[PDB]
Ligand binder design. Structure first.
Ligand SMILES: [Fe+2]
Ligand SMILES: [Fe+2]
Length: 131
């Protein structure tokens, strides 16, 4: 089974770009999750790096919109993003040094992060960003 399934009831923000970017993240995580059950380390690394670049771009997209519109909780929301980016960059540094592996606990971690963040953090920006 795919690790991540997006539905509007669970995850819809009422902000079209953000929903689309979330769908992409779920698809990219699902590919990583599959590859993480193998020993194909170069393929894991390609998909890890692609995912993380995209995630940083998604967070930038949300942050630019939040900030330009004066969204109430922008700085606290960005703090959540920045802590995940730090975790991901650390994981890349270790993985690309040969010091850590990417496995399905890695991908379940990121799944956990998104399935909590989108409903509890991203949905809150819907009224502001959709207005
Ligand atoms: Fe998001
Ligand atoms: Fe967010």
């Amino acid at each position: 089974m795919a690790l991540m399934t997006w539905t509007a009831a669970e995850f819809g923000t009422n902000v079209g770009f953000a929903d689309d970017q979330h769908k992409t993240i779920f698809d990219m995580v699902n590919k990583l999750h599959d590859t993480a059950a193998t020993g194909n380390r170069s393929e894991i690394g390609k998909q890890l790096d692609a995912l993380i670049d995209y995630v940083v771009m998604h967070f930038k997209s949300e942050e630019t919109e939040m900030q330009k519109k004066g969204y109430a909780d922008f700085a606290a929301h960005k703090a959540e993003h920045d802590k995940l980016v730090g975790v991901c960059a650390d994981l890349q540094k270790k993985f690309h040094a040969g010091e850590a592996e990417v496995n399905q606990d890695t991908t379940r971690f990121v799944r956990d992060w998104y399935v909590n963040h989108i409903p509890k953090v991203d949905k809150l920006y819907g009224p502001c960003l959709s207005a």
